[PDB]
Amino acid sequence: IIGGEFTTIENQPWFAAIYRRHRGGSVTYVCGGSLISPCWVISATHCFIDYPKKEDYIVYLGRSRLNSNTQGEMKFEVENLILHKDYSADTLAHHNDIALLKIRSKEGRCAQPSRTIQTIALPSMYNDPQFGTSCEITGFGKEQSTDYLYPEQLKMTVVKLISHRECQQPHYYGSEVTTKMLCAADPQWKTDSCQGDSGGPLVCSLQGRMTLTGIVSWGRGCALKDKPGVYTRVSHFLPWIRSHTK
Amino acid sequence: CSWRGLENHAAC
């Protein structure tokens, strides 16, 4: 998250911190995800597309910190790593950039809702907030494009939903942005999701309800003028989410 | 690769 603010998982308790175990045992942060049900973390396929082996993944819920334990955090293996079969990613856009991680602790349990572990409502289908709506994005992604490190501390920021019209403008993303994506950016482009925020939630309040409107998917750079964050428009993937979480 | 979309990518 470029700019925005540090936060803790209490402020995004559906936020799933998804890591990959490497051969050699190193565990790197992959992406955010959002707990959309106790067993289901939704994230971005691109986060996993190159390493689709579920066994490599560790999902934490209740994690406010990237490389240290957060009290009450839950560690999950990924029982199912469901990538969107229509995922595509050239050039820039990541299409159908949505992934489901069925999470299962070593105790065979899903997320146990706690102060730090909560699900995020999926939007009702094709029900997204209007452009200009401020939504939050959360992640452990880079705080600066040029950063090598991810923040240790979860961050959130607020970006405003950008209309598809605005976002497909050539000087934005042209046709890279689809209706299955939501662009969001800061008006000053000063804050944004960034690398490592992928998969994470774009949460809007569709009034009254914190709603997983978007999944951090892609963008050119981060907090780059005319380059919004692009989010998988979750409300356009409910059938897919439904058909895969049943 | 320094971009969202290439997290956890083989290259990158």
XYZ file of N, CA and C in Angstrom:
774
model
N 0.871 -1.194 0.000
C 0.000 0.000 0.000
C 0.882 1.210 0.000
N 0.761 1.995 -1.058
C 1.485 3.231 -1.152
C 0.680 4.204 -0.359
N 1.350 4.957 0.494
C 0.662 5.920 1.324
C -0.283 5.171 2.227
N -1.460 5.732 2.423
C -2.393 5.147 3.343
C -1.753 5.072 4.697
N -2.133 4.055 5.430
C -1.813 4.053 6.811
C -1.601 2.659 7.234
N -0.787 2.524 8.248
C -0.671 1.256 8.859
C -1.928 0.969 9.562
N -2.161 -0.304 9.702
C -3.364 -0.711 10.296
C -3.016 -2.008 10.924
N -3.991 -2.582 11.573
C -3.805 -3.898 12.059
C -4.970 -4.650 11.528
N -4.897 -5.946 11.720
C -5.833 -6.841 11.142
C -7.230 -6.599 11.683
N -7.326 -6.028 12.875
C -8.632 -5.701 13.411
C -9.389 -4.817 12.457
N -8.655 -4.064 11.652
C -9.296 -3.140 10.748
C -9.547 -3.698 9.402
N -9.169 -4.933 9.285
C -9.425 -5.660 8.065
C -9.327 -7.117 8.355
N -10.225 -7.562 9.233
C -9.998 -8.857 9.838
C -10.264 -10.002 8.896
N -10.758 -9.689 7.712
C -10.874 -10.700 6.682
C -9.599 -10.761 5.904
N -8.677 -9.869 6.198
C -7.498 -9.855 5.395
C -6.707 -11.102 5.639
N -6.358 -11.755 4.552
C -5.590 -12.950 4.648
C -4.246 -12.613 4.105
N -3.239 -13.023 4.842
C -1.889 -12.824 4.429
C -1.459 -14.155 3.887
N -1.110 -14.157 2.617
C -0.859 -15.404 1.967
C 0.591 -15.460 1.634
N 1.203 -16.542 2.074
C 2.606 -16.733 1.912
C 2.824 -17.981 1.148
N 4.010 -18.089 0.585
C 4.372 -19.306 -0.068
C 5.630 -19.824 0.566
N 5.605 -21.085 0.791
C 6.752 -21.763 1.260
C 7.555 -22.119 0.011
N 8.828 -21.859 0.033
C 9.675 -22.182 -1.094
C 10.340 -23.477 -0.753
N 10.853 -24.192 -1.750
C 11.648 -25.387 -1.514
C 12.834 -24.732 -0.872
N 13.291 -25.284 0.200
C 14.299 -24.673 0.975
C 13.643 -24.146 2.214
N 12.319 -24.043 2.210
C 11.542 -23.687 3.354
C 11.322 -22.243 3.594
N 11.915 -21.404 2.791
C 11.689 -19.991 2.995
C 10.243 -19.694 2.685
N 9.674 -18.800 3.434
C 8.328 -18.429 3.241
C 8.291 -16.998 2.881
N 7.784 -16.742 1.730
C 7.665 -15.378 1.276
C 6.218 -15.013 1.220
N 5.972 -13.746 1.459
C 4.660 -13.251 1.306
C 4.325 -13.235 -0.152
N 3.113 -13.654 -0.444
C 2.662 -13.708 -1.800
C 1.734 -12.552 -2.033
N 0.640 -12.550 -1.297
C -0.436 -11.679 -1.615
C -1.354 -11.637 -0.471
N -2.226 -10.652 -0.522
C -3.322 -10.593 0.383
C -4.425 -11.457 -0.135
N -5.406 -11.616 0.709
C -6.572 -12.333 0.327
C -7.596 -11.796 1.272
N -8.818 -12.215 1.065
C -9.872 -11.803 1.937
C -10.629 -13.018 2.309
N -10.856 -13.147 3.597
C -11.640 -14.225 4.096
C -13.080 -13.911 3.757
N -13.686 -14.724 2.908
C -15.053 -14.446 2.496
C -16.001 -15.440 3.114
N -15.398 -16.439 3.661
C -16.062 -17.400 4.497
C -15.033 -18.072 5.345
N -15.427 -18.719 6.419
C -14.400 -19.262 7.296
C -13.347 -20.082 6.558
N -13.762 -20.792 5.518
C -12.867 -21.698 4.824
C -12.294 -21.097 3.588
N -12.779 -19.921 3.231
C -12.471 -19.394 1.938
C -11.828 -18.055 2.015
N -10.630 -18.005 1.470
C -9.955 -16.765 1.268
C -10.005 -16.511 -0.207
N -10.389 -15.305 -0.563
C -10.404 -14.955 -1.944
C -9.228 -14.048 -2.178
N -8.567 -14.269 -3.290
C -7.388 -13.536 -3.576
C -7.356 -13.379 -5.073
N -6.171 -13.164 -5.609
C -6.015 -12.930 -7.022
C -5.278 -14.113 -7.565
N -5.749 -14.620 -8.685
C -5.085 -15.746 -9.290
C -3.645 -15.447 -9.592
N -3.351 -14.220 -10.000
C -2.006 -13.949 -10.450
C -1.041 -14.169 -9.312
N -1.560 -14.125 -8.095
C -0.731 -14.358 -6.933
C -0.196 -15.759 -6.887
N -0.852 -16.656 -7.601
C -0.603 -18.066 -7.423
C -0.335 -18.719 -8.725
N -0.641 -18.018 -9.805
C -0.660 -18.631 -11.115
C 0.655 -19.339 -11.426
N 1.756 -18.758 -10.969
C 3.070 -19.314 -11.253
C 3.442 -20.428 -10.306
N 2.790 -20.445 -9.155
C 3.012 -21.497 -8.193
C 1.666 -21.998 -7.715
N 0.939 -22.704 -8.591
C -0.442 -23.045 -8.288
C -0.590 -24.190 -7.296
N 0.535 -24.730 -6.833
C 0.522 -25.827 -5.880
C 0.069 -25.301 -4.531
N -1.139 -25.691 -4.138
C -1.743 -25.223 -2.895
C -0.861 -25.468 -1.676
N -0.134 -26.583 -1.680
C 0.645 -27.025 -0.522
C 1.746 -26.052 -0.140
N 2.141 -25.213 -1.089
C 3.214 -24.266 -0.872
C 2.707 -23.088 -0.069
N 1.391 -22.937 -0.023
C 0.828 -21.728 0.533
C 0.494 -21.816 1.977
N 0.740 -20.702 2.638
C 0.346 -20.541 3.999
C -0.535 -19.324 3.974
N -1.708 -19.453 4.558
C -2.581 -18.326 4.693
C -2.665 -18.017 6.156
N -2.428 -16.766 6.482
C -2.701 -16.339 7.817
C -3.899 -15.457 7.790
N -4.732 -15.642 8.794
C -5.753 -14.688 9.093
C -5.370 -14.113 10.420
N -5.884 -12.927 10.698
C -5.607 -12.268 11.955
C -4.177 -11.801 12.023
N -3.565 -11.618 10.869
C -2.181 -11.243 10.823
C -2.113 -9.767 10.492
N -1.486 -9.001 11.371
C -1.298 -7.577 11.144
C 0.091 -7.324 10.686
N 0.937 -8.319 10.867
C 2.333 -8.141 10.588
C 2.783 -9.172 9.617
N 3.740 -8.777 8.810
C 4.083 -9.569 7.679
C 4.965 -10.730 8.072
N 5.937 -10.465 8.927
C 6.947 -11.468 9.188
C 7.097 -11.762 10.646
N 6.087 -11.376 11.399
C 6.029 -11.764 12.779
C 4.614 -12.187 13.031
N 4.444 -12.970 14.080
C 3.140 -13.447 14.437
C 2.347 -12.287 14.992
N 1.052 -12.329 14.739
C 0.143 -11.406 15.346
C -0.619 -12.272 16.286
N -0.765 -11.801 17.504
C -1.471 -12.592 18.453
C -2.862 -12.874 17.937
N -3.248 -14.136 18.035
C -4.568 -14.555 17.622
C -4.611 -14.903 16.157
N -3.486 -14.743 15.472
C -3.456 -15.065 14.066
C -3.702 -16.547 13.896
N -4.271 -16.890 12.756
C -4.473 -18.274 12.432
C -3.708 -18.580 11.186
N -3.003 -19.695 11.231
C -2.211 -20.153 10.122
C -3.010 -21.232 9.436
N -3.074 -21.148 8.123
C -3.802 -22.138 7.380
C -2.946 -22.657 6.284
N -3.104 -23.940 6.026
C -2.654 -24.473 4.782
C -3.770 -24.201 3.800
N -3.449 -24.345 2.530
C -4.415 -24.112 1.496
C -4.845 -25.481 1.034
N -6.074 -25.810 1.404
C -6.684 -27.080 1.090
C -7.059 -27.117 -0.382
N -7.544 -25.993 -0.892
C -7.813 -25.841 -2.314
C -7.285 -24.495 -2.719
N -6.449 -24.481 -3.741
C -6.051 -23.240 -4.343
C -6.734 -23.207 -5.681
N -7.805 -22.438 -5.738
C -8.637 -22.402 -6.907
C -8.308 -21.140 -7.642
N -7.717 -21.317 -8.804
C -7.391 -20.198 -9.619
C -8.453 -20.114 -10.666
N -8.672 -18.910 -11.155
C -9.706 -18.717 -12.114
C -9.212 -19.236 -13.439
N -9.930 -20.203 -13.990
C -9.474 -20.876 -15.194
C -9.391 -19.933 -16.384
N -10.062 -18.795 -16.283
C -10.016 -17.809 -17.344
C -9.058 -16.700 -17.018
N -8.232 -16.939 -16.013
C -7.206 -15.994 -15.723
C -6.376 -15.793 -16.972
N -6.028 -14.546 -17.229
C -5.077 -14.235 -18.271
C -4.336 -12.990 -17.865
N -3.134 -12.961 -18.269
C -2.394 -11.873 -17.977
C -1.316 -11.497 -18.947
N -1.732 -10.948 -20.040
C -0.919 -10.095 -20.941
C -1.835 -9.030 -21.387
N -1.364 -7.802 -21.546
C -0.010 -7.475 -21.197
C -0.432 -7.227 -19.775
N -0.613 -6.000 -19.439
C -0.759 -5.609 -18.126
C -1.845 -6.070 -17.299
N -3.014 -6.159 -17.854
C -4.137 -6.529 -17.106
C -4.091 -7.940 -16.750
N -4.637 -8.151 -15.590
C -4.866 -9.484 -15.115
C -6.344 -9.702 -15.097
N -6.771 -10.603 -15.958
C -8.170 -10.845 -16.137
C -8.538 -12.002 -15.287
N -9.753 -11.939 -14.756
C -10.261 -12.999 -13.921
C -9.251 -13.260 -12.858
N -8.769 -12.163 -12.307
C -7.683 -12.270 -11.396
C -8.259 -12.490 -10.031
N -8.680 -13.721 -9.831
C -9.432 -14.039 -8.675
C -9.092 -15.455 -8.373
N -8.877 -15.710 -7.108
C -8.461 -16.999 -6.688
C -9.161 -17.239 -5.405
N -9.455 -18.492 -5.171
C -10.004 -18.884 -3.918
C -9.031 -19.819 -3.280
N -8.814 -19.596 -2.003
C -8.001 -20.474 -1.227
C -8.928 -21.012 -0.195
N -9.193 -22.301 -0.289
C -9.857 -22.952 0.792
C -8.782 -23.148 1.811
N -9.006 -22.589 2.980
C -7.998 -22.653 3.992
C -8.385 -23.704 4.996
N -7.369 -24.345 5.536
C -7.554 -25.408 6.487
C -6.318 -25.371 7.355
N -6.523 -25.149 8.646
C -5.433 -25.176 9.605
C -4.907 -26.599 9.701
N -3.756 -26.771 10.343
C -3.209 -28.111 10.540
C -4.121 -28.962 11.429
N -5.074 -28.297 12.079
C -6.084 -28.951 12.904
C -7.332 -29.252 12.084
N -7.246 -29.002 10.782
C -8.348 -29.269 9.866
C -9.484 -28.278 9.991
N -9.208 -27.144 10.627
C -10.226 -26.135 10.852
C -10.094 -24.983 9.873
N -11.219 -24.342 9.602
C -11.228 -23.122 8.823
C -10.996 -21.945 9.749
N -11.202 -20.742 9.227
C -11.119 -19.545 10.040
C -12.128 -19.637 11.158
N -11.649 -19.384 12.365
C -12.529 -19.194 13.494
C -12.639 -17.687 13.665
N -13.833 -17.128 13.392
C -14.024 -15.697 13.552
C -13.612 -15.241 14.939
N -12.834 -14.168 14.969
C -12.362 -13.583 16.200
C -12.324 -12.091 15.978
N -11.754 -11.375 16.930
C -11.619 -9.946 16.768
C -10.776 -9.612 15.541
N -9.879 -10.527 15.195
C -8.885 -10.275 14.165
C -9.143 -11.108 12.925
N -10.138 -11.979 13.005
C -10.459 -12.856 11.901
C -11.949 -12.774 11.687
N -12.337 -12.144 10.594
C -13.732 -11.998 10.268
C -13.820 -12.165 8.788
N -14.982 -12.569 8.313
C -15.183 -12.627 6.891
C -15.588 -11.265 6.392
N -15.380 -11.061 5.105
C -15.863 -9.882 4.447
C -16.963 -10.333 3.528
N -18.045 -9.574 3.532
C -19.163 -9.848 2.679
C -18.721 -9.693 1.251
N -19.188 -10.608 0.427
C -19.098 -10.415 -0.984
C -20.152 -9.402 -1.381
N -19.878 -8.637 -2.441
C -20.895 -7.744 -2.949
C -22.020 -8.581 -3.494
N -23.203 -8.002 -3.586
C -24.226 -8.641 -4.376
C -23.762 -8.468 -5.813
N -24.207 -9.359 -6.679
C -23.677 -9.394 -8.026
C -23.848 -8.077 -8.745
N -22.803 -7.683 -9.465
C -22.827 -6.483 -10.285
C -23.325 -5.296 -9.465
N -23.143 -5.396 -8.152
C -23.514 -4.329 -7.251
C -22.249 -3.780 -6.655
N -21.770 -2.719 -7.279
C -20.563 -2.065 -6.853
C -20.900 -0.645 -6.515
N -20.099 -0.040 -5.637
C -20.341 1.348 -5.330
C -20.085 2.188 -6.565
N -20.676 3.374 -6.589
C -20.504 4.290 -7.699
C -19.052 4.702 -7.789
N -18.622 5.098 -8.981
C -17.301 5.674 -9.131
C -17.175 6.850 -8.177
N -15.962 7.067 -7.696
C -15.716 8.121 -6.739
C -15.909 7.627 -5.326
N -16.542 6.464 -5.171
C -16.677 5.862 -3.857
C -15.304 5.565 -3.321
N -15.117 5.934 -2.072
C -13.898 5.640 -1.386
C -13.990 4.244 -0.861
N -12.992 3.459 -1.213
C -12.919 2.126 -0.723
C -11.586 1.959 -0.115
N -11.474 0.944 0.703
C -10.217 0.720 1.330
C -9.559 -0.451 0.679
N -8.251 -0.392 0.676
C -7.473 -1.503 0.244
C -6.508 -1.754 1.345
N -6.162 -3.011 1.477
C -5.388 -3.432 2.585
C -4.376 -4.350 2.047
N -3.192 -4.249 2.594
C -2.219 -5.198 2.232
C -0.909 -4.911 2.857
N -0.036 -5.859 2.614
C 1.306 -5.794 3.053
C 2.175 -5.451 1.899
N 1.567 -4.946 0.844
C 2.311 -4.644 -0.338
C 3.215 -3.466 -0.124
N 4.029 -3.217 -1.124
C 5.013 -2.183 -1.020
C 4.399 -0.872 -0.654
N 5.142 -0.129 0.128
C 4.712 1.170 0.511
C 5.188 2.172 -0.475
N 6.167 1.774 -1.262
C 6.654 2.600 -2.324
C 6.968 1.657 -3.427
N 6.724 2.106 -4.641
C 7.000 1.298 -5.798
C 8.433 0.838 -5.785
N 9.313 1.733 -5.356
C 10.740 1.477 -5.394
C 11.188 0.673 -4.193
N 10.283 0.446 -3.252
C 10.653 -0.343 -2.103
C 10.998 -1.737 -2.506
N 11.973 -2.276 -1.805
C 12.350 -3.640 -1.982
C 11.565 -4.436 -0.962
N 11.369 -3.833 0.201
C 10.724 -4.524 1.284
C 9.257 -4.261 1.275
N 8.532 -5.234 1.784
C 7.174 -5.018 2.128
C 7.167 -4.472 3.511
N 6.149 -3.670 3.812
C 5.961 -3.231 5.158
C 5.724 -4.427 6.026
N 6.247 -4.337 7.232
C 6.029 -5.360 8.202
C 4.626 -5.274 8.714
N 4.051 -4.094 8.608
C 2.793 -3.840 9.230
C 1.783 -3.661 8.154
N 0.637 -4.262 8.374
C -0.426 -4.182 7.438
C -0.757 -2.742 7.199
N -1.097 -2.450 5.967
C -1.472 -1.123 5.640
C -2.785 -1.133 4.993
N -3.402 0.018 5.052
C -4.621 0.204 4.373
C -4.578 1.555 3.803
N -5.299 1.707 2.731
C -5.518 3.021 2.292
C -6.869 3.067 1.692
N -7.203 4.250 1.242
C -8.464 4.486 0.656
C -8.158 4.945 -0.729
N -8.870 4.353 -1.658
C -8.764 4.749 -3.017
C -10.182 4.940 -3.429
N -10.366 5.745 -4.450
C -11.693 5.978 -4.935
C -11.887 5.170 -6.179
N -13.044 4.531 -6.244
C -13.446 3.806 -7.419
C -13.457 4.740 -8.604
N -12.866 4.265 -9.679
C -12.819 5.008 -10.903
C -13.763 4.304 -11.848
N -14.537 5.087 -12.586
C -15.446 4.521 -13.563
C -14.636 3.743 -14.582
N -15.206 2.706 -15.125
C -14.558 2.071 -16.225
C -14.226 3.001 -17.370
N -15.104 3.941 -17.666
C -14.826 4.920 -18.716
C -13.509 5.649 -18.475
N -13.330 6.113 -17.253
C -12.157 6.852 -16.910
C -10.948 5.924 -16.991
N -11.165 4.770 -16.473
C -10.066 3.833 -16.410
C -9.725 3.223 -17.760
N -10.630 3.186 -18.705
C -10.136 2.568 -19.911
C -9.528 3.633 -20.788
N -9.772 4.888 -20.444
C -9.035 5.898 -21.185
C -7.657 5.342 -21.506
N -7.200 5.531 -22.754
C -5.874 5.073 -23.143
C -4.783 5.498 -22.163
N -4.843 6.741 -21.686
C -3.812 7.261 -20.790
C -3.957 6.698 -19.380
N -5.100 6.075 -19.110
C -5.212 5.203 -17.958
C -4.810 3.816 -18.429
N -5.778 2.928 -18.625
C -5.445 1.566 -19.014
C -5.987 1.108 -20.345
N -6.705 1.986 -21.031
C -7.365 1.600 -22.269
C -8.227 0.377 -22.027
N -8.161 -0.579 -22.945
C -9.010 -1.759 -22.874
C -8.459 -2.852 -21.958
N -7.333 -2.570 -21.302
C -6.774 -3.492 -20.316
C -7.752 -3.652 -19.159
N -8.402 -2.555 -18.783
C -9.445 -2.615 -17.771
C -10.738 -3.105 -18.406
N -11.296 -4.152 -17.817
C -12.559 -4.695 -18.269
C -13.620 -4.386 -17.234
N -14.870 -4.675 -17.580
C -15.982 -4.516 -16.652
C -15.879 -5.477 -15.472
N -15.024 -6.492 -15.595
C -14.787 -7.453 -14.515
C -13.682 -6.950 -13.611
N -13.260 -5.726 -13.877
C -12.279 -5.073 -13.054
C -12.842 -3.788 -12.537
N -12.298 -3.352 -11.421
C -12.628 -2.055 -10.911
C -11.342 -1.330 -10.766
N -11.324 -0.112 -11.261
C -10.205 0.732 -11.021
C -10.491 1.547 -9.812
N -9.450 1.760 -9.042
C -9.551 2.613 -7.907
C -8.221 3.280 -7.803
N -8.257 4.525 -7.386
C -7.044 5.264 -7.234
C -7.339 6.390 -6.317
N -6.285 6.961 -5.856
C -6.408 8.152 -5.155
C -6.440 9.292 -6.149
N -7.164 10.316 -5.818
C -7.274 11.408 -6.740
C -5.968 12.087 -6.998
N -5.085 11.978 -6.053
C -3.809 12.559 -6.153
C -2.848 11.502 -6.489
N -3.353 10.339 -6.726
C -2.540 9.208 -6.994
C -1.488 8.965 -5.975
N -1.761 9.328 -4.778
C -0.729 9.348 -3.785
C -0.733 8.124 -2.956
N -1.765 7.406 -3.143
C -1.921 6.214 -2.381
C -2.540 5.174 -3.268
N -2.183 3.933 -3.021
C -2.566 2.924 -3.944
C -2.146 1.622 -3.376
N -2.701 0.575 -3.944
C -2.160 -0.712 -3.690
C -0.894 -0.789 -4.492
N -0.058 -1.711 -4.102
C 1.149 -1.863 -4.811
C 1.518 -3.302 -4.755
N 2.648 -3.597 -5.260
C 3.049 -4.909 -5.288
C 2.987 -5.534 -3.960
N 2.450 -6.732 -3.926
C 2.292 -7.444 -2.685
C 0.933 -7.191 -2.103
N 0.248 -6.168 -2.591
C -1.114 -5.949 -2.155
C -2.059 -6.755 -2.951
N -1.560 -7.328 -4.025
C -2.414 -8.115 -4.866
C -3.138 -9.143 -4.071
N -4.356 -9.412 -4.502
C -5.137 -10.441 -3.885
C -5.893 -9.871 -2.723
N -5.403 -8.755 -2.202
C -5.989 -8.161 -1.040
C -7.306 -7.521 -1.363
N -8.011 -7.116 -0.323
C -9.345 -6.600 -0.458
C -9.371 -5.162 -0.877
N -10.273 -4.882 -1.789
C -10.744 -3.552 -1.974
C -12.101 -3.623 -1.342
N -12.238 -2.957 -0.213
C -13.458 -3.049 0.531
C -14.154 -1.731 0.422
N -15.406 -1.795 0.015
C -16.206 -0.610 -0.045
C -17.363 -0.851 0.864
N -17.959 0.213 1.283
C -19.118 0.014 2.048
C -20.163 0.181 1.035
N -20.896 -0.842 0.829
C -21.938 -0.816 -0.150
C -23.028 -0.746 0.802
N -23.482 0.518 0.947
C -23.771 1.178 2.083
C -24.296 0.152 3.005
N -23.762 0.277 4.181
C -24.112 -0.527 5.272
C -23.227 -1.681 5.363
N -22.575 -2.137 4.319
C -21.926 -3.373 4.532
C -20.552 -3.247 4.002
N -19.606 -3.574 4.810
C -18.253 -3.727 4.305
C -18.295 -4.850 3.297
N -17.824 -4.546 2.101
C -18.054 -5.410 0.981
C -16.764 -5.572 0.243
N -16.440 -6.815 -0.065
C -15.274 -7.091 -0.853
C -15.586 -6.744 -2.285
N -15.454 -5.470 -2.592
C -15.770 -4.971 -3.906
C -14.712 -5.390 -4.894
N -13.481 -5.424 -4.426
C -12.393 -5.635 -5.322
C -11.352 -6.499 -4.692
N -10.560 -7.093 -5.556
C -9.411 -7.819 -5.135
C -8.308 -7.129 -5.856
N -7.301 -6.732 -5.105
C -6.190 -6.055 -5.689
C -5.659 -6.961 -6.749
N -5.619 -6.441 -7.956
C -5.264 -7.277 -9.052
C -4.022 -6.766 -9.733
N -4.098 -5.583 -10.311
C -2.980 -5.135 -11.095
C -2.988 -3.649 -11.233
N -1.938 -3.131 -11.834
C -1.866 -1.722 -12.071
C -0.517 -1.458 -12.657
N -0.395 -0.393 -13.340
C 0.887 -0.050 -13.780
C 1.462 0.734 -12.662
N 2.518 0.195 -12.131
C 3.201 0.833 -11.073
C 2.259 0.909 -9.926
N 2.485 1.886 -9.110
C 1.628 2.084 -7.972
C 1.598 3.541 -7.686
N 0.420 4.033 -7.326
C 0.269 5.434 -7.015
C 0.934 6.222 -8.131
N 0.711 5.762 -9.356
C 1.209 6.438 -10.537
C 0.039 7.191 -11.109
N 0.250 8.467 -11.410
C -0.777 9.273 -12.048
C -1.324 8.524 -13.254
N -2.650 8.506 -13.363
C -3.368 7.911 -14.492
C -3.243 6.405 -14.553
N -2.714 5.821 -13.492
C -2.577 4.388 -13.446
C -3.229 3.913 -12.175
N -4.557 3.759 -12.204
C -5.214 3.296 -11.012
C -4.775 1.910 -10.633
N -5.059 1.569 -9.393
C -5.077 0.199 -9.002
C -6.232 -0.412 -9.738
N -6.012 -1.611 -10.232
C -7.085 -2.334 -10.833
C -7.365 -3.521 -9.970
N -8.649 -3.733 -9.766
C -9.141 -4.689 -8.828
C -10.053 -5.578 -9.565
N -9.972 -6.847 -9.236
C -10.934 -7.776 -9.724
C -12.248 -7.320 -9.144
N -13.210 -7.162 -10.007
C -14.462 -6.685 -9.545
C -15.207 -7.855 -9.050
N -15.156 -8.073 -7.781
C -15.666 -9.279 -7.152
C -17.123 -9.527 -7.494
N -17.885 -8.448 -7.632
C -19.312 -8.546 -7.878
C -19.585 -9.124 -9.250
N -18.546 -9.235 -10.072
C -18.670 -9.836 -11.395
C -18.191 -11.278 -11.389
N -17.866 -11.782 -10.205
C -17.344 -13.130 -10.072
C -18.086 -13.950 -9.064
N -19.258 -13.481 -8.673
C -20.006 -14.212 -7.686
C -20.353 -15.607 -8.165
N -20.804 -15.756 -9.435
C -21.070 -17.116 -9.896
C -19.819 -17.965 -9.744
N -18.681 -17.422 -10.160
C -17.432 -18.143 -10.037
C -17.112 -18.450 -8.582
N -17.273 -17.460 -7.713
C -16.999 -17.671 -6.305
C -17.958 -18.713 -5.761
N -19.239 -18.543 -6.085
C -20.292 -19.457 -5.666
C -19.959 -20.869 -6.134
N -19.733 -21.015 -7.439
C -19.480 -22.317 -8.061
C -18.222 -23.005 -7.538
N -17.391 -22.264 -6.809
C -16.134 -22.809 -6.312
C -16.040 -22.913 -4.801
N -17.015 -22.338 -4.105
C -17.017 -22.340 -2.646
C -18.142 -23.187 -2.057
N -18.861 -23.823 -2.978
C -20.048 -24.583 -2.597
C -19.525 -25.826 -1.949
N 7.428 -6.828 -12.815
C 7.769 -7.438 -11.544
C 7.850 -6.459 -10.466
N 7.741 -5.222 -10.602
C 7.716 -4.619 -9.306
C 6.276 -4.227 -9.073
N 5.417 -4.767 -9.922
C 4.089 -4.340 -10.083
C 3.228 -5.391 -9.485
N 2.052 -4.938 -9.064
C 1.030 -5.861 -8.783
C 0.749 -6.623 -10.044
N 0.564 -7.923 -9.888
C 0.366 -8.834 -10.956
C 1.479 -9.812 -11.061
N 2.646 -9.464 -10.578
C 3.744 -10.374 -10.632
C 4.232 -10.872 -9.314
N 3.398 -10.797 -8.298
C 3.770 -11.289 -7.013
C 3.879 -12.728 -7.191
N 4.880 -13.283 -6.568
C 4.999 -14.691 -6.565
C 5.000 -15.219 -7.996
N 5.802 -14.585 -8.788
C 5.991 -15.048 -10.138
C 7.386 -15.595 -10.332
N 7.481 -16.580 -11.195
C 8.710 -17.365 -11.326
C 9.857 -16.487 -11.733
N 9.548 -15.677 -12.656
C 10.525 -14.836 -13.065
C 10.574 -14.014 -11.795
N 10.251 -12.830 -12.047
C 10.296 -11.717 -11.099
C 11.098 -12.093 -9.895
